[PDB]
Design an enzyme around this catalytic site. Structure first.
Site, PDB file in Angstrom:
ATOM      1  N   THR A 158     -26.747  19.032  -8.740  1.00  0.00           N
ATOM      2  CA  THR A 158     -26.686  20.400  -9.539  1.00  0.00           C
ATOM      3  C   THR A 158     -25.545  20.461  -9.862  1.00  0.00           C
ATOM      4  O   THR A 158     -24.621  20.186  -9.770  1.00  0.00           O
ATOM      5  CB  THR A 158     -26.860  21.306  -8.428  1.00  0.00           C
ATOM      6  N   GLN A 159     -25.552  21.068 -11.301  1.00  0.00           N
ATOM      7  CA  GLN A 159     -24.430  21.038 -12.439  1.00  0.00           C
ATOM      8  C   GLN A 159     -24.928  22.209 -13.170  1.00  0.00           C
ATOM      9  O   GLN A 159     -25.982  22.955 -13.008  1.00  0.00           O
ATOM     10  CB  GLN A 159     -23.765  20.350 -13.474  1.00  0.00           C
TER      11      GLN A 159
ATOM     12  N   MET B 286     -32.184  15.587  -7.473  1.00  0.00           N
ATOM     13  CA  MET B 286     -31.686  17.419  -7.387  1.00  0.00           C
ATOM     14  C   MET B 286     -30.522  17.328  -8.273  1.00  0.00           C
ATOM     15  O   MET B 286     -29.402  17.858  -8.097  1.00  0.00           O
ATOM     16  CB  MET B 286     -31.014  18.037  -6.150  1.00  0.00           C
TER      17      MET B 286
END
Ligand code: BO2
Ligand code: MG
Ligand code: MG
Ligand code: MG
Ligand code: MG
Lengths: 240, 233, 222, 244, 212, 231, 235, 204, 195
Positions: free
Chosen positions: B1-2, B107
């Site tokens: 996730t970013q 993810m």
């Protein structure tokens, strides 16, 4: 890890490492198993070359796997401890998951499976041990007696012997043991077991160990004096 | 996730009778700051495919390298690399779609919306979309971001269904795209006047147009607009 | 925060006949209040006389269908080109879905075909692999609109015979392929009226002993 | 490849013997003799250092007798370096048991654990076995005073009196002759030294060529004391018994 | 969901409802909540549909492997403990299961084990599991005896599910009846609540609250 | 002699004997023939039986809708390699939506077999393969050897007595290559080619095994009464 | 010494060929397939009279529709049977159906060549896998340690195999009944066995579509032995 | 919730003329509930004394751990561990659990057998050494103990006087803490004799 | 589960454990035995989170039974309690800790003394004359502080235990459906069938 294939086939279709493991069993002290109508008896030889021994603490030849099953053996003593430990663990594991103690056939099948695994695994040699596994299944009065060997094959026996000079005692049992009418009592069964060992043992002093197993987890080891009484009675009848 | 940092806005496209057209502006935004004014967001693959990318620019550059490497790998031990066994738009798209869905499944997505435009071996038009979620779809017109809301409505007036594709010429199709880019400059606060346009035709091949500008804008009416209601001066 | 799931809308419908089966689904694909495509096929022929659709999140839907088609291919390789029966396909799909129990395929799956006795069969799945054979099932966004209509018009629920007044039920007479297609078309027209994610086009796949046939019908584009 | 150079340390002979175990036992038979004698009121451990020098610092030296815990000790016969590897493992094992059950480890359990380690090297891993034989002298509240021995095969047995290393055949005959069940520690001390004095390959048995230890209940009230004898203390007991 | 099982003179009665819901939406009225593990073992299911189906179907595979290996049918205790040990590995991961493992063997006799996704495993005579379990308990406890006929016991189980189907919003559809004996289980039909309610009301004289 | 104990050892003349012994296993295997035209590609295989009660060992394996092979030697090794091809063909489809090129399929088999010839512990594959297929560049026929060497050919044969069929194809080269849009005549030429490798035994109904792939023809295998037409 | 996966100059794997010699030393096992069922029979061969012969398990159930007989180093077969049982049950779990006999056999044979320097040597046991499925009907397979399996109408393995196989060559025809097949196995076993054939030192089994796989009781086999003696004395 | 104040308890140590003293309370509880009044917190390995406050399971675990390590030390070194060396061992052992620490407040006390010098030391839960000349405090009433020690303490106290000071420091500190008390023990340590005294205190 | 009590008298240890098993709003069972025999002279009662309690108890039981077979010898209660404590102390820093509190009542045949150990899920061991887990101690410890004497007989211990149960039945909100009482002494373990 050490992955070397030690147990392998030869041109004539033999696995020499398994066959040489049987020779180690042949060297081992004699062990005998006889089942009666309502009991099983395990006889074992103690070589009298070793005196000045402490018989209290010296590892006994017959080992309890559970409260209702016992295991004796012929062959390498150190190897036997590994099989016994694994068997004892599997016995408790079976009680934990199945909520019922192992059958004698199941425990034998497990031990035999371990022995087999060591005949086609890399980096290991076979167990130089043959076992006699005896006892009574839970809530069952039928006596059980099984044999295993380094190859991993197992089978049930009315009576059987393993170890050094086992050929002689097997000869004795084959003529003396009747299937249609086996030893009805504990006395008759123990007597036949002691008789069979007396063909090989030498002296009947501290060289014979006897262990009687009865139904419902009733296991007891006979003392020196109790066994000596059987030795006395057998020879007195023989003098005729 | 970013989170996406340096970003590219709308990519728009449509099919016409003999091929496909695709366009995207040359801006790399840094939030509200219009940071980089010379970013090429249309990346050709061979002479038959153009991949238009919106969203995170660092991830776009990663995808650009993956495609560049794909051409190299396809040429290995391939005597027909510039003929029968050349890279097709369908091959290039499916590869990207596989990557996009794999990355979302770990993810750790590539924060992009991608449109692969091109022409197949048999002359068939190829136009398909894929994004950070691995979602894919095809349509006579495709657009990303603000383009989806403002460009598609205009482009769908030209090609509303499949049967309108053979009736649409390259001149009419290009005119619609250029008009859509003007509308986006009026209304998208993260767009620029400068843009690139690419045409992939089954006859005339790949035409790549750089340094285009939005022109013929209507602003004169602004002088008459005074205040916010009651003010007269 | 990154959200790995999305909602592509759409609606699907399976109906089992006496010697046939249909699997219908609208061709619209959406995100939020925008249309992605007016024609994006959703029901697929997977071989061995089986049709499949995985409605909900399209990326997961495509992945699942792709993996099942793959499963059919390897079933032929591993078992001497044996035909994969509809019941066996259903069980296989359960394991595909439950395999991702803790990161699910966000879809409502329906397959249709013929059982080993030649009778029409429809199987329905939840996202995590629970399944059940049914004579009738609608799935997806407008499932809540369509299913009650099907309970009434396919299984004759709450219907009785005139004159008797609630004593004698309406007999469960079988439905022909022409009669089923009428109910499918009316189901989707009704769903299109009241559900914003349903429209554009209707594609129906009909499965018989002869094979897999297709029919397409226009739906409202607003 | 590498197979060419593998000695195959864990295989059976045609006769059913483990080559490396047998050869390790041959190595141990040349090691300094160690004797253990168990009495009713204690245990004696005696051991002969191998051809020492006058310049060997004896008082700080330890090659034969090692302490496993407060209740258990061992006499070594074989490769000292190999023995120390096993000794440190045994010390750890005793402490693990003490941490787990909050009770000192029973002698047999410790012996079985070390014996199982030795066994493993004969059945798997492709490594050479430990060329070491131990005499375990220990005490616990179950069986009281106990003597055990283990060898490279991983087989262990219990004893009233036992010898390992060199001249065990001659040593065991002498012990078998003079040992009695009602014997005491002071008498056992004398028997151990007399047995070494006759079996030794040296010209005369002296204090500088010996290591000695006792495990006595001879401690203030119901408890057990380990006594590793000092050079001067070995010299005194040699005069007392009438050997020097 | 409402599922029950109770031991009695003639073996075991097992009864379940048929409803499945997603929130307030009724997903299915025709769900099979009794799983035929083998000719002598039954499993009820409550909670997560997929969890229950998958793992009780899996349980049947483990029980079949047992009797192939041991040349003897698995005990109810061992079968139940295989499932409970499995779900215990997954504890905390979010499995949702409530089951009764019901069966008969020579050594045990008729036996019921309640097994649950928290790892709970309980032997007992009577169990009711699910959202409508309390409603079932009310009818069952007030009318239960060891000395019940197969015919009367079956009706009590049927009636207890009906009670819960009526009051519990997340229970309903139909009633599946099973009877487990020395010679295995016996299916006793699907009973639609829509017809069963009015039948019971008229004949039994119950549900005087409702108008019909 | 001293240099044939394992695959990691060159002989003094630069030979790999374990690879050559693996090559020998192919010559012991039953004969199989491969040939192609511009439109179609055909495999013909003589199946072998253990005795009259036994079945005839299957020689042809399908890899994809457009590709498959025939085997000669250790059948389990053919199962391993064909499984690898199935996976590689399948990877190309799922990832790139692209049917795997027959030439590239040969390159993958070459590299897989090679790793086994250079590393200690493992062994070479003991089987030869004839791969046919139809891709974007028309019909193809490959010959795989477990040394790693893969060769694209118009026609060939491997196994016992395969030299007879190979000579026939070398004469017929100009004829059978021109058999376009006619599968039955191409098979006839293949059946006539494999017949040159026969001694004593002849082609019966359960002995013969044929496979074909082409322009509008998926890879299909023919056995039993389906090949009675060609006897 | 030499590698475990080494080829001979003739193109055969040394270890595989040597394991085949171990199988020749094993006790005889015979299988016969018919349209009414498949029959499996074995020689028990007890090493001593004190050995309880009923504990000798050389015929084994894999699933309800698949049975198995063994010959050679029978200890090696235990892991093969375990794998077969797991494969059969696992396929039923994944596909809600019985598994094809050929597919089951193929799964067992995949283990065969998984040996190197995985297990340290090939299996020293051959298997006769008999069963029934809806597609190909009643089937009999012979699974070797080479990884190869042949289907057979009839097959004998073990010490008296070549002598028994020659007898099966003449006797087998496509219209054999189940009863005729049972007697034929007993006839050939009696011919190749060292000791005299009876119900205690020989075992029968079969697999039918209706009743599935069944090991025959000693009382049932004894009658078939008595039925055999009379019909041979009849002419 | 806070691990260091679930069970409760205190330890204090002081130096005197050719002597040291270490003392602790006897309470073990589950928050408000008093469970045991025999839970001693001072242990000893040879002549080195260790008091441990904090989470009771870790108090027990660490005692068993340091018994383990000091026994192996003694076998290899052939001598008893000294207070200075033991202090380092405690610090090392605590710091190896830096990001998953034992929730304890150890206190070392003893006299060096060779030099005869009195020694005390305190630690935080992750191993930081506080080597004080005068006194060390630890536990749930550490604030109270600091106040008592800082006022009552004077250097070079005789063993029998030092007993009175440390006892009054502990007792009055414990009586102002809800999770401490329920009895107390005081060790008076000299070079070759150690006296242990149980104190009579209020049982609430 | 809910209430488990323990009391060590002159020549025995008495453990009392509730019979109720409550999941949610229903009492599923009213005859549940919350204990396992670890060895002939050692009994362990338990309470905590569902599933964990039985899983832990049986795991401990299996390990002690294994030790008994291996050594042909029964471990002392002190030794068993230390083993149990270490398992819980190990558990508390695991991925998913055992959420179980236990009482271990045993009779040491060597010292001829009864012994009661209280161990919580953190691995906090204490030897006590009387003990309890959960909310039980909040009522029972005050009674036991008053009445208990160290030389009580087993019959006096049961009367004192009845007085504890009566107080719990009066003042606790949850209906725990009575208790199963077990006595541990020189002759072994037996259950008081009427209580
Ligand atoms: B029952 O209510 O527990 C029922 C049993 C299940 C086997 C069908 N469960 C459900 O209906 C659950 C929702 C639920 C309601 C009440 C308590 C617990 C759970 N529904 C599902 O599992 C489900 C599965 N697929 C589609 C829709 N619902
Ligand atoms: Mg609209
Ligand atoms: Mg399990
Ligand atoms: Mg206080
Ligand atoms: Mg506590």
């Amino acid at each position: 890890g050490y992955d070397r294939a030690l147990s392998i086939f030869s041109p004539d279709g033999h696995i020499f490492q398994v066959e040489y493991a049987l020779e180690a069993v042949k060297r081992g002290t004699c062990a005998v198993g006889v089942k009666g109508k309502n009991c099983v008896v395990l006889g074992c030889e103690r070589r009298s070359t070793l005196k000045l021994q402490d018989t209290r603490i010296t590892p006994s030849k017959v080992s309890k796997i559970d409260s209702h099953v016992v295991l004796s053996f012929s062959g390498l003593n150190a190897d036997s401890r590994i099989l016994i430990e694994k068997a004892r663990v599997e016995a408790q594991s079976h009680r934990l998951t199945l909520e019922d103690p192992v059958t004698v056939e199941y425990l034998t099948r497990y031990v035999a499976g371990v022995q087999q695994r060591y005949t086609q695994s890399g980096g290991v040699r076979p167990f130089g041990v043959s076992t006699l596994i005896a006892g009574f299944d839970p809530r069952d009065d039928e006596p059980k007696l099984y044999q295993t060997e380094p190859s991993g094959i197992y089978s049930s026996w009315s009576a059987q012997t393993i170890g050094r000079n086992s050929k002689t005692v097997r000869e004795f049992l084959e003529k003396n043991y009747d299937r249609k009418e086996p030893p009805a009592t504990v006395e008759e069964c123990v007597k036949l077991t002691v008789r069979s060992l007396l063909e090989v043992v030498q002296t009947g002093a501290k060289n014979i160990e006897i262990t009687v197993v009865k139904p419902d987890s009733d296991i007891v080891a006979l003392s020196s004096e109790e066994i000596n009484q059987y030795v006395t009675q057998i020879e007195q009848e023989k003098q005729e | 996730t970013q989170q996406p940092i340096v970003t590219g806005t709308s990519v728009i496209s449509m099919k016409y009778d003999n091929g496909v057209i695709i366009a995207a502006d040359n801006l790399g935004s840094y939030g509200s700051l219009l940071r980089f004014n010379g970013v090429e967001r249309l990346i050709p693959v061979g002479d038959n495919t153009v991949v238009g990318i919106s969203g995170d620019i660092s991830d776009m550059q990663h995808i650009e390298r993956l495609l560049k490497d794909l051409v190299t790998e396809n040429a290995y031990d391939n005597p027909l690399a510039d003929a029968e066994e050349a890279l097709e738009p369908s091959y290039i798209f499916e590869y990207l779609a596989t990557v996009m869905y794999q990355r979302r499944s770990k993810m750790n997505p590539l924060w992009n919306a991608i449109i692969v435009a091109g022409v197949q071996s048999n002359g068939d038009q190829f136009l398909r979309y894929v994004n950070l979620l691995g979602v894919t779809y095809s349509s006579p017109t495709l657009a990303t971001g603000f383009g989806a809301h403002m460009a598609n409505p205009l482009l769908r007036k030209v090609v509303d269904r499949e049967s309108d594709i053979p009736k649409t010429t390259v001149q009419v199709a290009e005119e619609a795209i250029v008009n859509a880019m003007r509308v986006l400059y009026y209304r998208d606060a993260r767009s620029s006047r400068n843009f690139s346009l690419a045409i992939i035709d089954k006859n005339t091949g790949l035409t790549f147009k750089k340094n285009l500008q939005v022109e013929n804008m209507k602003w004169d009416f602004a002088k008459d607009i005074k205040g916010y209601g009651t003010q007269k001066i | 925060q990154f959200n790995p799931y999305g909602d592509n809308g759409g609606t699907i419908l399976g109906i089992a006949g006496e010697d046939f089966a249909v699997l219908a689904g609208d061709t619209r694909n959406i995100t939020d209040y925008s249309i992605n495509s007016r024609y994006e096929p959703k029901v697929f022929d997977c071989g061995d006389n089986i049709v499949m659709s995985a409605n909900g999140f399209a990326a997961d839907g495509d992945a699942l269908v792709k993996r099942f088609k793959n499963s059919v291919k390897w079933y032929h390789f591993d078992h001497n080109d044996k035909k994969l029966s509809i019941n066996s396909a259903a069980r296989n799909i359960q394991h595909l879905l439950y395999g991702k129990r803790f990161f699910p395929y966000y879809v409502h799956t329906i397959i249709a075909g013929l059982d080993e006795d030649g009778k029409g069969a429809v199987y329905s799945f939840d996202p995590v692999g629970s399944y059940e054979r049914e004579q009738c099932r609608a799935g997806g966004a407008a499932a809540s609109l369509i299913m009650p209509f099907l309970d009434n018009q396919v299984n004759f629920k709450n219907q009785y015979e005139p004159g008797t007044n609630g004593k004698v039920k309406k007999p469960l007479k079988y439905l022909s392929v022409e009669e089923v297609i009428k109910l499918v078309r009316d189901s989707f027209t009704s769903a299109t009226e009241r559900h914003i994610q349903v429209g554009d086009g209707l594609e129906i796949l009909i499965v018989t002993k002869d094979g897999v046939r297709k029919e397409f019908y226009e739906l409202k584009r607003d | 490849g590498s197979r060419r150079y593998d000695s195959r340390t864990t295989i059976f002979s045609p006769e059913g013997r483990l080559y490396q175990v047998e050869y390790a036992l041959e190595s141990i038979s040349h090691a300094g003799t160690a004797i253990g004698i168990m009495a009713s009121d204690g245990i004696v451990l005696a051991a002969e250092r191998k051809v020492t020098s006058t310049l060997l610092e004896q008082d700080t030296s330890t090659e034969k007798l090692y302490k496993l815990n407060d209740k258990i000790a061992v006499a070594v016969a074989g490769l000292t370096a190999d023995a120390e590897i096993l000794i440190n493992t045994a010390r750890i094992h005793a402490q693990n048991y003490l941490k787990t059950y909050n009770e000192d480890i029973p002698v047999e359990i410790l012996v079985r654990r070390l014996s199982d380690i030795k066994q493993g090297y004969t059945q798997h891993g492709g490594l050479r076995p430990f060329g070491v034989s131990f005499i375990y002298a220990g005490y616990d509240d179950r069986y009281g005073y106990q003597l055990y021995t283990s060898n490279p095969s991983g087989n262990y047995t219990g004893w009233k009196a036992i010898s390992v290393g060199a001249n065990t055949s001659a040593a065991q005959t002498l012990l078998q002759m003079d040992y009695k069940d009602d014997m005491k520690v002071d008498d056992a001390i004398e028997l151990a030294l007399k047995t070494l004095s006759k079996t030794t390959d040296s010209s005369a048995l002296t204090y500088d060529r010996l290591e000695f230890a006792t495990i006595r209940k001879g401690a203030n009230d119901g408890e057990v004391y380990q006594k590793i004898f000092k050079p001067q203390e070995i010299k005194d007991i040699l005069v007392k018994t009438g050997i020097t | 969901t409402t599922t029950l099982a109770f031991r009695f003179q003639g073996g075991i009665i097992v009864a379940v409802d048929s409803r499945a819901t997603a929130g307030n939406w009724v997903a299915s009225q025709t769900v099979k909540k009794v799983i035929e593990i083998n000719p002598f073992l039954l499993g009820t299911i409550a909670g997560g549909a997929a969890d229950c189906q998958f793992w009780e179907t899996w349980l049947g595979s483990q029980c079949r492997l047992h009797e192939l290996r041991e040349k003897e049918r698995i005990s109810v205790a061992a079968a139940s403990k295989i499932l409970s040990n499995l779900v215990y590995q997954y504890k905390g991961a979010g499995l949702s299961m409530g089951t009764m493992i019901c069966g008969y063997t020579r050594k045990e006799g008729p036996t019921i084990y309640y097994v649950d996704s928290d790892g709970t495993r309980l032997k007992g005579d009577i169990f009711c599991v699910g959202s409508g379990q309390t409603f079932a308990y009310g009818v069952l406890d007030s009318n239960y005896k060891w000395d019940l006929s197969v015919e009367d016991a079956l009706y009590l189980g049927k009636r207890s599910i009906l009670a819960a189907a009526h009051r519990d919003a997340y229970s309903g559809g139909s009633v599946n009846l099973y009877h487990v004996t020395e010679d295995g289980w016996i299916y006793h039909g699907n009973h639609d609540v829509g017809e069963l309610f009015w039948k019971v009301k008229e004949e039994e004289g119950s549900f005087n609250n409702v108008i019909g | 002699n001293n240099y044939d104990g394992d695959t990691v050892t060159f002989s003094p003349t630069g030979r790999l004997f374990q690879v050559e012994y693996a090559l020998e296993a192919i010559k012991q295997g039953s004969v199989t023939v491969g040939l192609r035209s511009n439109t179609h590609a055909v495999l013909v295989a003589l199946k072998r039986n253990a005795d009259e009660l036994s079945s005839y060992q299957k020689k042809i394996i399908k890899c994809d809708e457009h590709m498959g092979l025939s085997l000669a030697g250790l059948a389990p090794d053919a199962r391993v390699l064909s499984n690898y091809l199935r996976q590689q063909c399948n990877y190309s489809s799922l990832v790139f939506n692209r049917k795997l090129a027959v030439e590239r399929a040969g390159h993958l088999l070459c590299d897989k077999a090679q790793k086994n010839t250079q590393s200690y512990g493992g062994r070479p594959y003991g089987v030869g393969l004839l791969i046919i297929g139809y891709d974007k560049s028309g019909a193809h026929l490959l010959e795989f050897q477990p040394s790693g060497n893969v060769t694209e050919l118009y026609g060939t044969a491997i196994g016992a007595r395969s030299q007879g069929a190979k000579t026939y194809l070398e004469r017929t080269l100009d004829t059978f290559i021109k058999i376009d849009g006619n599968p039955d005549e191409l098979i006839k030429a293949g059946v006539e080619a494999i017949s040159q490798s026969l001694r004593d035994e002849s082609l019966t109904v359960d002995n013969l095994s044929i496979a074909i792939v082409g322009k509008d023809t998926p890879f299909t295998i023919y056995d039993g009464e389906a090949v009675a037409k060609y006897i | 010494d030499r590698g475990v996966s080494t080829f001979s100059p003739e193109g055969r794997l040394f270890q595989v060929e040597y394991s085949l010699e171990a199988i020749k030393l094993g006790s005889t096992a015979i299988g016969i397939a018919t349209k009414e069922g498949v029959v499996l029979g074995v020689e028990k061969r007890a090493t001593s009279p004190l050995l309880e012969s009923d504990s000798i398990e050389k015929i084994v159930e894999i699933d309800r529709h698949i049975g198995c007989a063994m010959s050679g180093l029978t200890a090696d077969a235990r892991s093969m049977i375990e794998h077969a049982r797991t494969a059969a049950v696992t396929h039923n779990l994944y596909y809600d159906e019985d598994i094809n006999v050929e597919s089951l056999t193929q799964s067992v044979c995949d283990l065969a060549l998984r040996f190197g320097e995985l297990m340290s040597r090939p299996f020293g046991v051959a298997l006769l896998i008999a069963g029934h499925d809806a597609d190909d009907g009643y089937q009999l397979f012979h699974a070797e340690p080479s990884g190869t399996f042949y289907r057979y109408n009839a097959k004998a393995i073990g010490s008296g195999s070549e002598g028994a196989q020659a007898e099966l060559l003449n006797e087998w025809h496509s219209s054999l009944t189940l009863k005729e097949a049972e007697l034929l196995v007993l006839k050939i076993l009696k011919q190749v066995m060292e000791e005299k054939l009876d119900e205690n030192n020989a075992q029968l089994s079969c697999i039918t579509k209706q009743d599935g796989f069944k090991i025959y009781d000693n009382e049932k086999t004894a009658e078939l032995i008595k039925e055999l003696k009379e019909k041979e004395a009849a002419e | 919730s806070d691990p260091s104040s679930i069970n409760g308890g205190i330890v204090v140590a002081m130096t005197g003329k050719d002597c040291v003293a270490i003392a602790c309370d006897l309470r073990l509880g589950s928050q408000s509930l008093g469970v045991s009044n025999k839970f001693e917190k001072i242990f000893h390995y040879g002549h080195v004394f260790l008091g441990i406050t904090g989470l009771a399971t870790d108090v027990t675990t660490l005692n068993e751990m340091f018994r383990y390590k000091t026994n192996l030390y003694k076998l290899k070194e052939e001598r008893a561990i000294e207070p200075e060396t033991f202090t380092q061992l405690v610090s090392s052992s605590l710091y190896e659990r830096r990001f998953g620490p034992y929730f304890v407040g150890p206190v070392v006390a003893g006299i060096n057998s060779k030099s005869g010098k009195p020694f005390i030391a305190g630690f935080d839960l992750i191993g930081c050494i506080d080597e004080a000349k005068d006194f060390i405090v630890s536990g749930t009433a550490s604030d109270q103990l600091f106040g008592m020690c800082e006022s009552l303490y004077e250097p070079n106290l005789e063993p029998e006087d030092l007993f009175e000071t440390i006892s009054q420091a502990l007792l009055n500190a414990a009586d102002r803490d809800a999770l401490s008390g329920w009895g107390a023990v005081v060790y008076i340590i000299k070079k070759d004799e150690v006296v242990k005294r149980y104190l009579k205190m209020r049982q609430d | 589960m809910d209430i488990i009590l323990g009391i060590r008298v002159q020549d025995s240890v008495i453990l009392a454990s509730s019979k109720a098993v409550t999941r949610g709003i229903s009492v599923l069972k009213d005859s549940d035995d919350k204990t396992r025999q670890l060895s002939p002279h050692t009994l362990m009662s338990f309470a905590g989170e569902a599933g964990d309690t039985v899983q832990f108890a049986e795991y401990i039981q299996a390990n002690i039974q294994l030790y008994s077979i291996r050594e042909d010898y029964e471990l002392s209660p002190q030794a068993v309690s230390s083993f149990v404590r270490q398992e819980l102390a190990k558990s508390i820093r695991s991925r998913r800790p055992y959420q179980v509190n236990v009482l271990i009542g045993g009779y040491d045949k060597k010292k001829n003394k009864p012994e009661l150990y209280q161990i919580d899920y953190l691995g906090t061991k204490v030897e006590l004359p009387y003990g309890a887990h959960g909310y039980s101690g909040f009522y029972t410890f005050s009674l036991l502080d008053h009445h208990y004497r160290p030389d009580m007989t087993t019959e006096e211990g049961l009367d004192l235990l009845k007085l504890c149960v009566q107080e719990l039945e009066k003042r606790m909100p949850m209906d725990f459906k009575g208790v199963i009482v077990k006595i541990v002494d020189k002759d072994g373990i037996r259950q008081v069938d009427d209580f």
